[PDB]
Design a binder for this molecule. Structure first.
Ligand SMILES: O=[N+]([O-])c1ccc(O[C@@H]2O[C@H](CO)[C@@H](O[C@@H]3O[C@H](CO[C@H]4OC[C@@H](O)[C@H](O)[C@H]4O)[C@@H](O[C@@H]4O[C@H](CO[C@H]5OC[C@@H](O)[C@H](O)[C@H]5O)[C@@H](O[C@@H]5O[C@H](CO)[C@@H](O)[C@H](O)[C@H]5O)[C@H](O)[C@H]4O)[C@H](O)[C@H]3O)[C@H](O)[C@H]2F)c([N+](=O)[O-])c1
Length: 370
């Protein structure tokens, strides 16, 4: 015991308002939004340029057509590093935000995010035992504190764990088992709550190659799997050319350039996307396990001008419609990555500071795709 037990008030199993299976829950969610660069920001909730989450932002997200939110949360910067005790004020603030999302009729997925890298960059034998102790300490405290919410609240163990081979997968499987067991041990509605488990780097290919088994659960049929999607990188996140490839400015049948053809895609087009989602339909969906697509988005290139600017924005939108539609046909639940920015290379579709829509084009695209 590197840390004290934080499972000091376990409750009797309770299935009141927890009656859906993972499959039945997935059936109610077609379109999700990440509260990005907010509760997981290093230095505090407002340290990366966004305001504190408000009832009126969450009301906008619902009234705009979203069924759910993913809330990345930071934890380690708020904890005593001797005891792994998390600040009681932070635990109360996260509870308050969950309460507000549930009051607006959203499903809610809370995680431990990158969180400064303590677990995420450390999927190794050297770090396995200390990280298993922290994972257990933090999840005992988070689940105890959020124990009383109904099935609108889901928990996700990790974000994008850096596991690249089989030895790293075994280490991750251990991390994921410590999660499940910590949650169930606190015994509320947490006896039956749907938990979400992350594939290696939440990458589709690595997950296809390396994924073996889902963790063991005292509960029956209450697990989903998680991947993310920034494919192709050159289009969605690349901000400068390298020896190994060029930024793509344009995407999709119908929206390719005739004047500027090096800035069209050399790979990662409609058919590749179809192929990638199919791998997750076979491994998980066809086998009674829903798949959360926890993060996707291509960034705005508002440094372009003229017909270049207009063609980029037309393909950028189609990219978002196509991903959403094709994800949902295969049983993947699409959650849009929104960092809140409205400047060059950002992903915010709302203006957080005025609670208005900033990018009506991409919002329309996600809804048409849904
Ligand atoms: O071949 N594979 O196996 C394979 C694996 C992975 C691949 O792609 C990567 O997948 C991972 C997981 O999905 C991605 O991580 C998520 O990515 C989000 C978007 O990241 C980008 O945002 C914009 C750019 O800044 C940059 O391209 C990327 O970071 C990410 O959100 C961003 O979080 C930033 C903070 O970063 C910290 O936490 C995440 C962590 O990975 C990163 O190491 C760490 O530093 C935000 O940046 C901050 O912004 C504030 C405010 O302006 C500044 O003040 C700070 O200085 C600055 O740090 C950023 O704005 C936000 O969008 C999610 O947190 C994360 O889960 C990863 O991006 C993919 F690269 C691929 N593949 O080919 O794509 C293949």
């Amino acid at each position: 015991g590197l840390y004290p037990s934080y499972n000091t008030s376990p409750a009797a199993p309770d299935s009141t308002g927890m009656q859906s299976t993972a499959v039945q829950l997935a059936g109610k969610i077609r379109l999700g939004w990440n509260i990005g660069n907010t509760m997981e920001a290093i230095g505090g909730e407002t340290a990366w340029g966004n305001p504190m989450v408000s009832n009126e932002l969450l009301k906008l997200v619902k009234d705009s057509g979203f069924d759910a939110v993913r809330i990345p949360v930071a934890w380690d910067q708020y904890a005593n590093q001797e005891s792994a005790e998390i600040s009681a004020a932070w635990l109360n603030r996260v509870k308050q935000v969950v309460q507000m999302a549930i009051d607006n009729e959203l499903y809610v997925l809370i995680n431990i995010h990158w969180d400064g890298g303590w677990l995420e960059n450390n999927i190794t034998p050297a770090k396995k035992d200390e990280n298993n102790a922290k994972q257990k300490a933090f999840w005992e405290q988070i689940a105890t504190h959020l124990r009383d919410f109904d099935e609108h609240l889901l928990f996700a163990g990790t974000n994008a764990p850096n596991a690249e081979n089989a030895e790293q997968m075994d280490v991750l499987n251990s991390y994921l088992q410590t999660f499940v067991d910590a949650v169930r041990s606190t015994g509320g509605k947490n006896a039956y709550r749907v938990l979400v488990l992350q594939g290696p780097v939440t990458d589709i290919e690595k997950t296809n190659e390396l994924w073996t088994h889902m963790p063991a659960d005292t509960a029956t049929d209450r697990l989903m799997a998680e991947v993310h999607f920034y494919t192709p990188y050159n289009f969605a996140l690349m901000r400068q050319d390298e020896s190994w490839g060029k930024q793509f400015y344009y995407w999709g049948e119908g929206f390719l350039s005739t004047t500027d053809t090096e800035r069209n895609p050399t790979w990662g087009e409609e058919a590749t996307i179809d192929q990638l989602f199919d791998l997750m339909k076979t491994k998980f969906v066809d086998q009674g396990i829903p798949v959360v697509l926890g993060e996707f988005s291509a960034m705005r290139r508002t440094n372009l001008t003229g017909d270049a600017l207009t063609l980029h924005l037309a393909g950028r939108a189609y990219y978002h419609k196509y991903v959403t539609q094709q994800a949902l046909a295969r049983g993947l639940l699409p959650f849009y990555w929104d960092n809140g920015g409205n400047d060059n290379f950002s992903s915010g579709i709302f203006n957080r500071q005025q609670n208005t829509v900033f990018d009506q084009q991409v919002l329309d695209a996600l809804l048409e795709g849904a």
